[PDB]
């Protein structure tokens, strides 16, 4: 058998006691990235379907929580994400703005206006 976190980098870190200076509770280091799926090491306090945020300004949804790693799906091109990046919790499941402030507005899947008519009013949010 084998695990994806058994790469020699993690074992190297843990052998010489370098795993105590890294906060493996609210941050993680990308083990793999490919075809829009990142496999992250750490994020031990991350909830299923919670949104994490990569160092390069991208977002992602953590879908697969396995014993070794977290499977995050990236909300954009995985061009900007590299192995070793830093992924931070956002703390909240994905939610979107709601209200009459959206009527007549074209928005994308996450409530961001894409019609260039200005910001989106948004008084209330909803999961």
């Amino acid at each position: 058998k084998t695990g994806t976190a058994e790469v020699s980098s993690i074992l190297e870190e843990r052998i010489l006691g370098a795993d105590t200076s890294v906060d493996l509770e609210e941050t993680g280091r990308v083990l793999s990235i490919g075809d829009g799926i990142a496999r992250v090491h750490g994020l031990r306090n991350v909830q299923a379907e919670e949104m994490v945020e990569f160092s390069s300004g991208l977002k992602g949804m953590s879908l697969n929580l396995e014993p070794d790693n977290v499977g995050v799906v990236v909300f954009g091109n995985d061009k900007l994400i590299k192995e070793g990046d830093i992924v931070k919790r956002t703390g909240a499941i994905v939610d979107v703005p709601v209200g009459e402030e959206l009527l007549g507005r074209v928005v994308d899947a996450l409530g961001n206006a894409i019609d260039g008519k200005g910001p989106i009013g948004s008084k209330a949010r909803r999961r």
Partner: protein, 188 residues
Amino acid sequence: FAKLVRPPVQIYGIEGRYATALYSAASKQNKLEQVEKELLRVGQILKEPKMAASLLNPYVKRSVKVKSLSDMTAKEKFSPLTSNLINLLAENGRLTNTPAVISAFSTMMSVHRGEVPCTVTTASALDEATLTELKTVLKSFLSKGQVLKLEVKIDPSIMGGMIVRIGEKYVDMSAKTKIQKLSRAMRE
């Protein structure tokens, strides 16, 4: 990530990854000789029939195994590197392939100190003078500082001559291959 220093010979597999982690950890800080000695020590320590019987049973919890191994490591005064390696192998449940790690590191350490395993095969044994000239010429084959590690097996299956392996280099002056070559030349 931490730019690990690669070993000379790349060992692959689970043992390869654990051994490469250990080698990278030791190479920085510089403790390769001491850690290799400690690895040889744990080679026998775990081999004890009681310890082996208590570590090959997957129904003793990993907690108990880690505690027993911590007690053994403290009782033997190891480097923190070897203690952490044993702890890591115990947590991941990779104890059943611990020797393969110690073996791997050995293969990984021998090349570090410069060694090129060699093999010589002949129909019958050799007189020590001829073995001495073999030593000399083979050391001629190697480079500078690369000690040699000769092995002289005896294969009567071949009908004479010699067969020599130096690393991946191979020279076959055995009567059997010459017989085969000439015979195949006839049939064509």
